[PDB]
Amino acid sequence: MNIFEMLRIDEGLRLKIYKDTEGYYTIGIGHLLTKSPSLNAAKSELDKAIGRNTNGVITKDEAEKLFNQDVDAAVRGILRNAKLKPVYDSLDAVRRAAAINMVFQMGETGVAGFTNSLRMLQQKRWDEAAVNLAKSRWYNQTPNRAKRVITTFRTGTWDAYK
């Protein structure tokens, strides 16, 4: 297991424009195109991201390319974030993947407002962190995915991913 494999399980792979769990136009491996309700706007964002006129359809290679960029972006965002960086740095490699997972899904502003969970994570109070993390819109809207990510923070193992 690793962050790529973990997010591939959580996000799936779809080669045509689809709506994510929040109803937002998405493609590939959880690559959010736009929060706009306009499919044409989404198609424009897609073409811009890929560098050609796609008409809402991409290849697996193209999907994996955006995915690599997105994982890269999520990590680089964490390291540029003054609230996230020290917590991330304090973590082991398995829990670091759980942190990337969260940022990938909800964006770094979203995650940085988990102030109390973040503190508990840095103090390595794993059971307490886990309980706090579940007290969230995140958990209620995507409980199965959240439970997997939380188990990863709680245990520092990949048990929730097999």
Task: Determine the Cα–Cα distance for residues 147 and 130; give it in Å rounded to an integer.
Answer: 9
Q: Which domains does the chain have, with CATH numbers?
A: 1-162 (1.10.530.40)
Task: Determine the Cα–Cα distance for residues 55 and 157; give it in Å rounded to an integer.
Answer: 41
The answer to whether 36 is a known ligand-binding residue is no
CA nearest to 151, candidates 101, 110, 108, 106: 101
Q: What is the DSSP letter of 57?
A: B
The answer to whether 140 is a known ligand-binding residue is no
Tokens 């990337």 sit at which residue? 100
Active site residues: 11, 20
Task: Determine the Cα–Cα distance for residues 8 and 4; give it in Å rounded to an integer.
Answer: 6
Q: What is the resolution of this structure in A?
A: 1.9
The answer to whether 104 is a known ligand-binding residue is yes
Q: Is 92 helix (H, G, I), strand (E, B) or coil?
A: coil
Structure tokens at 71: 């994982």
Experimental method of this PDB entry: X-ray
Structure tokens at 35: 């929060």
Structure tokens at 33: 């195109």
**How do 14-19 and 25-28 pair as beta strands?**
antiparallel
Q: Please give the distance of CA 134 from its chain centroid, rounded to a whole number.
A: 16
Say which amino acid occupies 84. L
> Residue 33 to residues 53, 56, 79: CA-CA distances in angstroms?
15, 11, 23
CA nearest to 111, candidates 143, 145, 148, 74: 74
Helix (H) or strand (E) holding 30: none
Tokens 């003054």 sit at which residue? 82
